[PDB]
Design an enzyme around this catalytic site. Sequence first.
Site, mmCIF file in Angstrom:
data_model
loop_
_atom_site.group_PDB
_atom_site.id
_atom_site.type_symbol
_atom_site.label_atom_id
_atom_site.label_comp_id
_atom_site.label_asym_id
_atom_site.label_seq_id
_atom_site.Cartn_x
_atom_site.Cartn_y
_atom_site.Cartn_z
ATOM 1 N N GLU A 78 -7.498 4.704 7.197
ATOM 2 C CA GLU A 78 -7.315 6.107 6.944
ATOM 3 C C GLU A 78 -8.572 6.686 6.313
ATOM 4 O OE1 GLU A 78 -3.658 5.695 4.900
ATOM 5 O OE2 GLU A 78 -2.626 5.362 6.801
ATOM 6 N N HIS A 84 -9.827 1.126 3.916
ATOM 7 C CA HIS A 84 -8.633 1.340 4.728
ATOM 8 C C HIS A 84 -8.962 2.223 5.904
ATOM 9 C CE1 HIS A 84 -4.595 2.562 5.964
ATOM 10 N NE2 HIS A 84 -4.253 1.389 5.465
ATOM 11 N N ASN A 131 0.864 -1.158 0.000
ATOM 12 C CA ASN A 131 0.000 0.000 0.000
ATOM 13 C C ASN A 131 0.909 1.218 0.000
ATOM 14 O OD1 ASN A 131 -1.847 1.985 0.266
ATOM 15 N ND2 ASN A 131 -2.583 1.361 2.345
ATOM 16 N N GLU A 168 -5.922 -4.783 10.223
ATOM 17 C CA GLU A 168 -4.894 -3.810 10.587
ATOM 18 C C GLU A 168 -5.351 -3.054 11.815
ATOM 19 O OE1 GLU A 168 -4.546 -1.529 6.760
ATOM 20 O OE2 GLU A 168 -2.595 -2.634 6.718
ATOM 21 N N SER A 177 2.706 -1.824 10.716
ATOM 22 C CA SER A 177 4.103 -1.874 11.114
ATOM 23 C C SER A 177 4.834 -3.172 10.734
ATOM 24 C CB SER A 177 4.248 -1.513 12.593
ATOM 25 O OG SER A 177 3.817 -0.179 12.785
ATOM 26 N N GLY A 214 1.705 2.676 11.128
ATOM 27 C CA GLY A 214 2.685 3.742 11.082
ATOM 28 C C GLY A 214 3.306 4.145 12.404
ATOM 29 N N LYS A 226 0.173 4.136 -0.353
ATOM 30 C CA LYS A 226 -0.556 5.284 0.168
ATOM 31 C C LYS A 226 -0.334 6.467 -0.756
ATOM 32 C CE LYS A 226 -0.718 3.310 4.744
ATOM 33 N NZ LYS A 226 -0.700 3.502 6.196
#
Lengths: 249, 249
Positions: A96, A94, A10, A166, A212, A172, A12
Site C-alpha cells: 500500500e 508494505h 497488520n 504478499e 487474503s 484484500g 492497517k
Amino acid sequence: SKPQPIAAANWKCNGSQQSLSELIDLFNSTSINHDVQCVVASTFVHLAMTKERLSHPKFVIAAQNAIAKSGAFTGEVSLPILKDFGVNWIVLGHSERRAYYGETNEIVADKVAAAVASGFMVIACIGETLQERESGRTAVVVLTQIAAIAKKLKKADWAKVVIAYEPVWAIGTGKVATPQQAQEAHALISSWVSSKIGADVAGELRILYGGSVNGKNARTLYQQRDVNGFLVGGASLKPEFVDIIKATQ
Amino acid sequence: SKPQPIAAANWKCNGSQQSLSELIDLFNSTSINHDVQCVVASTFVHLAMTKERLSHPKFVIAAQNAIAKSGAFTGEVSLPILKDFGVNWIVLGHSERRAYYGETNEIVADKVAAAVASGFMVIACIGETLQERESGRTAVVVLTQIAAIAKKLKKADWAKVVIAYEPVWAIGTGKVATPQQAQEAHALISSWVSSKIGADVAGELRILYGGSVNGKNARTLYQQRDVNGFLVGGASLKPEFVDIIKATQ
C-alpha cells in the site's frame, strides 16, 4: 526444520479504542501452546493503548511505517521516536505504501536498513502486482525487490529481518495464493537469500505469506516448506486471527 | 478588530517522552492573560501522552496529518481514528507534505473538507516557494492553493478553518518574512476570502503566519493587521514558545 514462525496482525488504518480493546482482550485470553512470535501492528495513534493493554506473552507490538530520522517531516513518525516509545518491531515497504505513498524499492531498502541499524525487528514486504504476475514477471520483481533491500544490509543484519511475501493481487481481494503459488515464491526468495547472503541466513530466515490469509486457509499454507508464518490484514481485526496463530504448526 | 488568535506548536517529527513531558510541564505552568487558542500538534505516537499530560485550559491537542477514511492504508492515520481518540484539531497541507509526500492542492483540499466534515478545526497551510516568490508568482500560487480549498467547502464551514500562510523559503531557513512581507500576503488572502466567501467570513478568519517565527520576532509580526497568530516549528520545541503565545496579546 523451520525457524520460529510469526503470526503478524497488520491492522492497517483501522480500529477504535473500544474495538481494538475488545480484540486485545480476546488475544490476551487465548492460550497458545506452540512457539510462535505474534505481532500486532497498530496505527501510531493506538501504540500507547496497545502497549498498555496487550499482555499476552507471545505478542509484541509493531509500527506500520516510519521514516529514518526525526526532523522537519510534518505528519511522519521516525524510528528514534518509536524506539524511545518502546516499539521494537516494524512493518516496512508494505505494498500500500509502495503504491500509494511513493515507496520505491530503494526507499524501502533505506528504511529497512535504518530500522535494523536502530535495533528493530523488521517485517519487510515484497511482492508482485497483478500486472507483473500476469505478464510473467513475478520472479524478477520479487528478486529485484529483495536485492534492493539486501544492497543496504550487511550479513549480520538479517537476524533482524523477516520477509513478508504478499502478492498484491491477493491483498484484500479474497484471492489467496494457493499453497503451490506461495511455496514457489517463497522457495525462490529463499534460494536467492541462500546464494547471495548465505545458507545459514536462509535457514534462519522467516518468509511470511500475506494476502487474503484467513482462519480456514492458513493451515494448508503453513504446511509448505518455505512458509514461516503470515502477515494478516483483514482477518487480523477479527477473532479468527487466533485460528491463524493456531495454524502455524 | 481581530478574532481570537491562535498560537500553534508544530512539533513536526520530533520529541522523546521525556523531552516533550518537560515542554508540556512548562506550558502547563504558563499564565496566559488573554484569549488565545494554544495548539500542540504532536506526532501521532505522542498524542496519548500529550492528551493526558497537558492540563492548561488554553491548550488543545492536534494531529499533523491524516487521511480521510479508515481502511487499507498501511501506516496512515484517518480522521475517524483521530476523532475517536479525542483529537479535534489538525494541521493539513503542510509544506513538507506538499513537497515530500505528494500532497497537491486538490489532495490538501479534499483532506481539509473531510476534516471539516468530521468536525475538526483545521489549520490549512498555504505558501509559495522561493522560486515562486522571486518570479513574481506569489499571489497566483497562494490564491490558487486557497481557491482549491474553498472549492470543497461551503460558506458555513469556514468557521472550522484556520489558514496558515508559511512561505516555504521561511521554513527552517532562518529567513523569517518581514512584517511587511507577512502582512502583504495575509492581506491578499484576507481580501480574497472577503471577495470569494464573504466579508463576514474574512473578518472572523484567523490567518496565522509561520516560517522561522521565534520569541523575539513574534510580536512585530503579530502587530500586523491581518496576522492572527502563528504556526511555529523549531521554536515550539523550546521555552520561547511561551513568548510567542504572549506576543498574541
